[PDB]
Amino acid sequence: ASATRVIQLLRNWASGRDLQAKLQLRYQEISKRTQPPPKLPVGPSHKLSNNYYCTRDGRREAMPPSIVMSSQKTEKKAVTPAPPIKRWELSKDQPYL
Amino acid sequence: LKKTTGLVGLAVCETPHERLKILYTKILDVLGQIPKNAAYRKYTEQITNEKLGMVKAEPDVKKLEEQLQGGQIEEVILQAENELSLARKMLRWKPWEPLVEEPPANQWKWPI
Amino acid sequence: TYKFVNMREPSMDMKSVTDRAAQTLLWTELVRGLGMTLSYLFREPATINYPFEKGPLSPRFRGEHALRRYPSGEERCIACKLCEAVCPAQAITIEAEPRADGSRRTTRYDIDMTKCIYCGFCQEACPVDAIVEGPNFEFSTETHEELLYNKEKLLNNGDKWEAEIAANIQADYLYR
Amino acid sequence: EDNKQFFGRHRWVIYTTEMNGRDTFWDVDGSMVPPEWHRWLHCMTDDP
Amino acid sequence: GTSVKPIFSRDMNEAKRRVRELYRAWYREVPNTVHLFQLDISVKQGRDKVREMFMKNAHVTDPRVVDLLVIKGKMELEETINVWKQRTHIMRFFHETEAPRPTDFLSKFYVGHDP
Amino acid sequence: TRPTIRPRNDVVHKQLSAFGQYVAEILPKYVQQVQVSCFNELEIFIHPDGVIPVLTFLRDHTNAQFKSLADLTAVDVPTRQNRFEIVYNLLSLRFNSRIRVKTYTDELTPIESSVTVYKAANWYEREIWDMFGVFFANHPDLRRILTDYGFEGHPFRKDFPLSGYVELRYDDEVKRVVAEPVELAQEFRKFDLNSPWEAFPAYRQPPE
Amino acid sequence: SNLIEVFVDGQSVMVEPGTTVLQACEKVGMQIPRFCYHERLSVAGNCRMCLVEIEKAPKVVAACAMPVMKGWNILTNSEKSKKAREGVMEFLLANHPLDCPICDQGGECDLQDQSMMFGSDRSRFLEGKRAVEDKNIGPLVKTIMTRCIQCTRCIRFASEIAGVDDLGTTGRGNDMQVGTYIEKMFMSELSGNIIDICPVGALTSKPYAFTARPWETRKTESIDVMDAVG
Amino acid sequence: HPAAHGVLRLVMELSGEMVRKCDPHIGLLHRGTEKLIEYKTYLQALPYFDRLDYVSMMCNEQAYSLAVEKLLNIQPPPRAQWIRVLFGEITRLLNHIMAVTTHALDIGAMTPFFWMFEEREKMFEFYERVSGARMHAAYIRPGGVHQDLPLGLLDDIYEFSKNFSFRIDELEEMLTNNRIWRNRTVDIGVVTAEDALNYGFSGVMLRGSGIQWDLRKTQPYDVYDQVEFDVPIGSRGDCYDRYLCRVEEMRQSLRIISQCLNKMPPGEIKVDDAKVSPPKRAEMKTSMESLIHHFKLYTEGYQVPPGATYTAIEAPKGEFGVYLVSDGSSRPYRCKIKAPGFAHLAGLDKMSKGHMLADVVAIIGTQDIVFGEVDR
Amino acid sequence: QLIAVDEKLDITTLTGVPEEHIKTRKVRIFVPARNNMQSGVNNTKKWKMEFDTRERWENPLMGWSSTADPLSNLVLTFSTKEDAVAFAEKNGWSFDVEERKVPKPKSKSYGANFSWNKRTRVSTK
Numbered sequence A: 001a002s003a004t005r006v007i008q009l010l011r012n013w014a015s016g017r018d019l020q021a022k023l024q025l026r027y028q029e030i031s032k033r034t035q036p037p038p039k040l041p042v043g044p045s046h047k048l049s050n051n052y053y054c055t056r057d058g059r060r061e062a063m064p065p066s067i068v069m070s071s072q073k074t075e076k077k078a079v080t081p082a083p084p085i086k087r088w089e090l091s092k093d094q095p096y097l
Numbered sequence B: 001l002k003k004t005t006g007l008v009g010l011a012v013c014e015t016p017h018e019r020l021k022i023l024y025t026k027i028l029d030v031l032g033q034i035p036k037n038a039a040y041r042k043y044t045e046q047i048t049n050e051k052l053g054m055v056k057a058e059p060d061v062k063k064l065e066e067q068l069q070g071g072q073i074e075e076v077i078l079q080a081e082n083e084l085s086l087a088r089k090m091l092r093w094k095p096w097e098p099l100v101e102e103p104p105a106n107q108w109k110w111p112i
Numbered sequence C: 001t002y003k004f005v006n007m008r009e010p011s012m013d014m015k016s017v018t019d020r021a022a023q024t025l026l027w028t029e030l031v032r033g034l035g036m037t038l039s040y041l042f043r044e045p046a047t048i049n050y051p052f053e054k055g056p057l058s059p060r061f062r063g064e065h066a067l068r069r070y071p072s073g074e075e076r077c078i079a080c081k082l083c084e085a086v087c088p089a090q091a092i093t094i095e096a097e098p099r100a101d102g103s104r105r106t107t108r109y110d111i112d113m114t115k116c117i118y119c120g121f122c123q124e125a126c127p128v129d130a131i132v133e134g135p136n137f138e139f140s141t142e143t144h145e146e147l148l149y150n151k152e153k154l155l156n157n158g159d160k161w162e163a164e165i166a167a168n169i170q171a172d173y174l175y176r
Numbered sequence D: 001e002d003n004k005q006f007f008g009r010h011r012w013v014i015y016t017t018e019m020n021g022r023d024t025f026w027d028v029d030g031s032m033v034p035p036e037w038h039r040w041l042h043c044m045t046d047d048p
Numbered sequence E: 001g002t003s004v005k006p007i008f009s010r011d012m013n014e015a016k017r018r019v020r021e022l023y024r025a026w027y028r029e030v031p032n033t034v035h036l037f038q039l040d041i042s043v044k045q046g047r048d049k050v051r052e053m054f055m056k057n058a059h060v061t062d063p064r065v066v067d068l069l070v071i072k073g074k075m076e077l078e079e080t081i082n083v084w085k086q087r088t089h090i091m092r093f094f095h096e097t098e099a100p101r102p103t104d105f106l107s108k109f110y111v112g113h114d115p
Numbered sequence F: 001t002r003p004t005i006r007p008r009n010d011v012v013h014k015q016l017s018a019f020g021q022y023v024a025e026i027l028p029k030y031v032q033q034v035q036v037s038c039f040n041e042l043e044i045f046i047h048p049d050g051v052i053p054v055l056t057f058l059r060d061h062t063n064a065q066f067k068s069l070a071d072l073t074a075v076d077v078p079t080r081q082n083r084f085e086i087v088y089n090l091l092s093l094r095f096n097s098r099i100r101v102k103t104y105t106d107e108l109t110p111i112e113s114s115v116t117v118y119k120a121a122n123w124y125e126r127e128i129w130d131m132f133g134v135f136f137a138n139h140p141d142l143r144r145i146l147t148d149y150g151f152e153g154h155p156f157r158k159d160f161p162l163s164g165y166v167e168l169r170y171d172d173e174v175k176r177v178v179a180e181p182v183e184l185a186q187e188f189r190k191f192d193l194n195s196p197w198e199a200f201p202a203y204r205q206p207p208e
Numbered sequence G: 001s002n003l004i005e006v007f008v009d010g011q012s013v014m015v016e017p018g019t020t021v022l023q024a025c026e027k028v029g030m031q032i033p034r035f036c037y038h039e040r041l042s043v044a045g046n047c048r049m050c051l052v053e054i055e056k057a058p059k060v061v062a063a064c065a066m067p068v069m070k071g072w073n074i075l076t077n078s079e080k081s082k083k084a085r086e087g088v089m090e091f092l093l094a095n096h097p098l099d100c101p102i103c104d105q106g107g108e109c110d111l112q113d114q115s116m117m118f119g120s121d122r123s124r125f126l127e128g129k130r131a132v133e134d135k136n137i138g139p140l141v142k143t144i145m146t147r148c149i150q151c152t153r154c155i156r157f158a159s160e161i162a163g164v165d166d167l168g169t170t171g172r173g174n175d176m177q178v179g180t181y182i183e184k185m186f187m188s189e190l191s192g193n194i195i196d197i198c199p200v201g202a203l204t205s206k207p208y209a210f211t212a213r214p215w216e217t218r219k220t221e222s223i224d225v226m227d228a229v230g
Numbered sequence H: 001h002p003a004a005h006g007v008l009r010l011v012m013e014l015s016g017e018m019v020r021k022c023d024p025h026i027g028l029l030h031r032g033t034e035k036l037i038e039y040k041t042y043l044q045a046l047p048y049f050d051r052l053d054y055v056s057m058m059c060n061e062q063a064y065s066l067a068v069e070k071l072l073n074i075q076p077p078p079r080a081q082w083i084r085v086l087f088g089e090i091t092r093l094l095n096h097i098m099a100v101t102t103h104a105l106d107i108g109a110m111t112p113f114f115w116m117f118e119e120r121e122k123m124f125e126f127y128e129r130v131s132g133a134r135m136h137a138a139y140i141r142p143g144g145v146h147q148d149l150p151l152g153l154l155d156d157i158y159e160f161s162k163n164f165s166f167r168i169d170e171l172e173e174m175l176t177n178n179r180i181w182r183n184r185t186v187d188i189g190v191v192t193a194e195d196a197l198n199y200g201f202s203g204v205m206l207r208g209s210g211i212q213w214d215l216r217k218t219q220p221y222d223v224y225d226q227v228e229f230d231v232p233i234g235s236r237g238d239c240y241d242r243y244l245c246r247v248e249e250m251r252q253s254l255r256i257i258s259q260c261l262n263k264m265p266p267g268e269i270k271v272d273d274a275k276v277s278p279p280k281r282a283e284m285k286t287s288m289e290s291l292i293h294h295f296k297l298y299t300e301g302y303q304v305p306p307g308a309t310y311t312a313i314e315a316p317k318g319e320f321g322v323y324l325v326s327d328g329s330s331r332p333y334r335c336k337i338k339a340p341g342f343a344h345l346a347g348l349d350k351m352s353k354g355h356m357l358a359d360v361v362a363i364i365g366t367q368d369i370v371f372g373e374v375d376r
Numbered sequence I: 001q002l003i004a005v006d007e008k009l010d011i012t013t014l015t016g017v018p019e020e021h022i023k024t025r026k027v028r029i030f031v032p033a034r035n036n037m038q039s040g041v042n043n044t045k046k047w048k049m050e051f052d053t054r055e056r057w058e059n060p061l062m063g064w065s066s067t068a069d070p071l072s073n074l075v076l077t078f079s080t081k082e083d084a085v086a087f088a089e090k091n092g093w094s095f096d097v098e099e100r101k102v103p104k105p106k107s108k109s110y111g112a113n114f115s116w117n118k119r120t121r122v123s124t125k
């Protein structure tokens, strides 16, 4: 900003770009240090009716893990833990750097 | 044909069909020495037979890779070799036998 | 969705070969790096003139602790011991008794500042805004013992910094 | 202040040479700023 | 019975054989340790300390415990030979800055409440 | 139930249950239990002797391909006769899945080292030796990794004191750093926080 | 024999005749929430925190007072039981003072703990709160009666265990107050026990006031030597 | 040692300057974090995850919060999740700047460090404005976030974000095509895909070898399935490819930050469940239920149902995981921490075979090692 | 392969505990008593092992509470008393065990408050 135009031209030629367009020092384009007060809305549980906690209690819906094959107690096609992953696509934006 | 498999240390395979056929045949041969009632034998036979039929039926490498869902046939060859090694190991281990020992009464009881 | 970073093939035409040979023999990219450094040399530095200039801070900043009062001059702390229970570093020590007028007040309130992690959990837990982390951060000492704050020191800090503490709280209490 | 400088160099304080009892011509520190000017100087607010 | 699985030794004889091998190794190492760390003790002091450390665990009657003790001793020896330990670690075996705690009843009664 | 409660995924639950049944059927010699958690995580409790077979299968079978070892650790439960619980967390990139394998040991029973299956296990196993004192058989180089040279005990055991037994300081007479019995100017203050009322009815135990 | 079979959440249990729903639930290791029921005092049934649903019964019963009937199925975790507990907790907190930081009962409050375990997490009460004047019943029991939830445990203890009839309730409705109605000192060799049975900070220890919180105390189980009872 | 990147005792057997053997000795920053966590409540143990990896602080907070949320069967609100993703990308920018600049400094190029640490300072300012701490925010909590954004933070984040690409371009002008830098980085520390998988590597250490794996794409968390970005993939498995991958990851993080800035929704910041997340101070000072819940949450803490979980995230240094075991109380029974640096350092000796001293320095730089997470 | 060890379990030499804290320590194995200020019984379900209280003094600076006992905060939880005893025995600690005290079953009757001729009649309600 304060730099003389010849210095700006030298900087632009050396760096190869227009430096003044994107300066790394923040002058006056940043937010003010004093702001108006906020209001901060309330959440979905702030109802006055039809809001019994037993219907929105996520901690009490946890259960002990389901047991398959306790040892102490047809073709049967083989399975996998999950379907195989699909191959990734090559970035139509910019595929090669 | 294809260059740069894309994974470091994974060489491009020339003649992948013959390699896959040899590997799957060896896998079936090893599985033939496992008891018939063992689950590992039947499961591995089923998947190996499906893959071998897919390889035999598809003369195109890219279409075969798309059919096998195995990721770039060189890794399919690597997985076949891994399965062959595992088949030999499980033949030596015999994991189809009944459970060797039962845990104590509260070994897996949680909480506490 | 993925992209390749090093999967490009150089052009093999005579012009490209000669350009690459000129780059090899005349060091073009090295001069490019020199030009970048030369460009930086003519920019204004980002240094500030400490201690005459200070780095920007926020009303939420967590610095030295302080114990506050009500506008009447009575202390805000009622010795509930919530800050002591929440302190992740066990940096707060509290002893309490009924005052001569029956008030519920502390007789010991210590914060070990070499134990404290300056997380601000104590001021979140306080139900009367009694303990706060103030804006001060320039309180280095010459001895370890000077960083073991008792109730007198914290009360002194509150009396000293209340003008800024109240203004900081006023600008942030609607986010809490 | 000078708002034409970049953020950080746009506010500064020339310290006193004579604090409570000590000579602060050469020996100055940031702790000598009082709390209200401390709030202004560190850009916690825009108003002096 | 008791259905236990060994580590290296099936009975105590093999455990004592491993103990003797480890003791030989430590006995041979002591002079080199004194030289390399520039310790102000004598080789006799170092070998006496090695013997005392070995005798601390003389009452053991479980071959698995003896095997684990030999493994730990080998860890300590490999740690000393490679100079992963410093002089402070070696000298920690001697407790030179610890005041002698008395063992008789009267001195304990005088100093404090602990038995 | 909608906004604040974590949603369920039954498809992943069914897939993990089917694969757990698959693994249990293939290796009856070692598999003792299979579980699928409410947040869709699959665990297989096995016998110690099957540490090397099971893992090998899970790494080499064409339908498992769990080629990454995410983590290996131990849990100390003093109330059990087998104190230590060895946990392997495995990741399969081919099928984008995770699996947990659990087994048990006590202080004097060694576990088979699995560096031959996963090279990542090496340091992990060393760590389990250092923090818990679980010996691993046929480990290429087993020694302390985290604790100080000459440190006695295994800190992550439940009976190990939080501050340990010794502390360090510089002594100017011997001109070196020395270790002495631990003394605390302020003792750590133990808090009793457990509420005397039950929190989760779904986990209530029988009254014995 | 004379035992009758009942069900707690479908689980069978054999109980003596005259056993209440609360005790049958206790047999299978379930603890019903309570404020007025004390197993060493007479049954009151006023706090209404113990209401549970009996299968095929449209009305919830007070588990602390209602004897079990043969073949009953107590559903301790049904929606009806949870909603009853939430409503009762809400009514108990409607007029309670926001005193927890200054209350000695802070980390030891059955009201607090049962609010966290069985009540709701919000208030929809938009009115002013009632406040009552404090009573002086001596130098041992500190009295802050705004925290009172009117469970009448102190009255029952004084009448039955201590053998004194100095405590009672005066007035009625929302204005019913626990006290002596006159300046009287509740002195007996067993008086301090009313501090223990009172579930709230309405009755606290005066010598112990403000000194400590319960989570930081270390417990040592020992014997008393002030007499020969041990 | 300046190239030790902190407290590492690398015992090296050398023939001349050729490295014959590497033996990393760690534990010089082992503070016993896991036992201490076993002595805390769930909220009290959160600031430990700030100090695990002190370059990717909020990412560690996010991983721990995800684990605790999974164990609690609750769900953060959407605005909290968008804030989490935005600050996770800002943290990724911070970590990648630190890694690349310290790597270059170890190699010998000391200039980009100073250029990029001013941007690091501005992001520290963002951290402090949101939390009151430049490094250890403790902002991301197991219910969401602690506080809402100040009323002008998004504008400043936008202003910073629209100028960062030029700083990346200057860094690349310094390093990308420099023949000295390429000589010091190309073909150094080459690891194959199968070795990388078997050794337990994650993050860039996989992607540099051509393995197509990113946890934000394969196992997305928070709102990572609603943003669009590319994954950089290497071809040679060397230090140069990993450097390129990290630069492109910084560019993709800028992309994600722009998407997050334009898509921030309204709403509450923590779960509307006062038995897990504390109420607002006005409610705590007016409502009886709110005061009881505030008291109990800040004294005892919330109870977590019993169970064990392994939660992993794509932290800027690789896969970062927590194995959390709850026994039903308000204190965690067990907390194992999985850091990628552990496996990377365990493979350092493998990657340094046939190299020199300076090559080993480069390999340590390219592994992106912070010893707080390695030693814990 | 099995070797048939015939001896009692003993791991003291491997635990790294100083011998002073092995021979002179006395542990208590007990079910903790219900806190009399509350009615809940969830804290009376498990067995606890805890060590004997040692000396605590005042720090000359700040007047804090100083200790020299490393086991002063060690508390262990067990399912049954047998497990706790086995742990203490294999760790070489002398122990005192207290049998679990349960409240006896009480006969409650709301109607007894209004008896015709018994003393259980209440004068107030």
Ligand SMILES: C=C(C)[C@H]1Cc2c(ccc3c2O[C@@H]2COc4cc(OC)c(OC)cc4[C@@H]2C3=O)O1
Binding pocket: H002, H003, H004, H005, H006, H007, H055, H098, H102, H113, H370
């Ligand atoms: C040399 C100037 C320009 C800077 C860079 C620098 C210091 C001071 C100290 C160190 C340093 O860099 C080296 C290498 O990179 C890390 C990275 C670390 O963690 C990210 C870390 O933690 C202890 C330590 C270090 C070294 C060390 O302590 O000022």
Ligand code: SF4
Binding pocket: C083, C086, C087, C088, C089, C090, C091, C092, C111, C115, C116, C117, C118, C119, C120, C121, C122, C123, C133
């Ligand atoms: S800021 Fe945090 S560490 Fe410091 S006293 Fe408060 S709660 Fe304790």
Ligand code: SF4
Binding pocket: C076, C077, C078, C079, C080, C081, C082, C083, C084, C094, C122, C125, C126, C127, C128, C129, C130, C131, G101
């Ligand atoms: S400072 Fe606040 S939280 Fe701490 S004891 Fe005093 S009133 Fe309670």
Ligand code: SF4
Binding pocket: G096, G097, G098, G099, G100, G101, G103, G104, G105, G106, G107, G109, G111, G112, G147, G199, G200, G201, G202, H292
């Ligand atoms: S009686 Fe209980 S709820 Fe009421 S103020 Fe005291 S501690 Fe809080």
Ligand code: SF4
Binding pocket: G147, G148, G149, G150, G151, G152, G153, G154, G155, G178, G197, G198, G199, G200, G202, G203
């Ligand atoms: S003072 Fe306490 S015991 Fe007496 S009625 Fe009120 S709440 Fe119940």
Ligand code: FES
Binding pocket: G033, G034, G035, G036, G037, G044, G045, G046, G047, G048, G049, G050, G051, G062, G063, G064, G065
């Ligand atoms: S406990 Fe039954 S009504 Fe009070």
Ligand SMILES: [Mg+2]
Binding pocket: G105, G195, G196, G197, G198, G199, G200, G201, G202, G203, G204
């Ligand atoms: Mg009371």
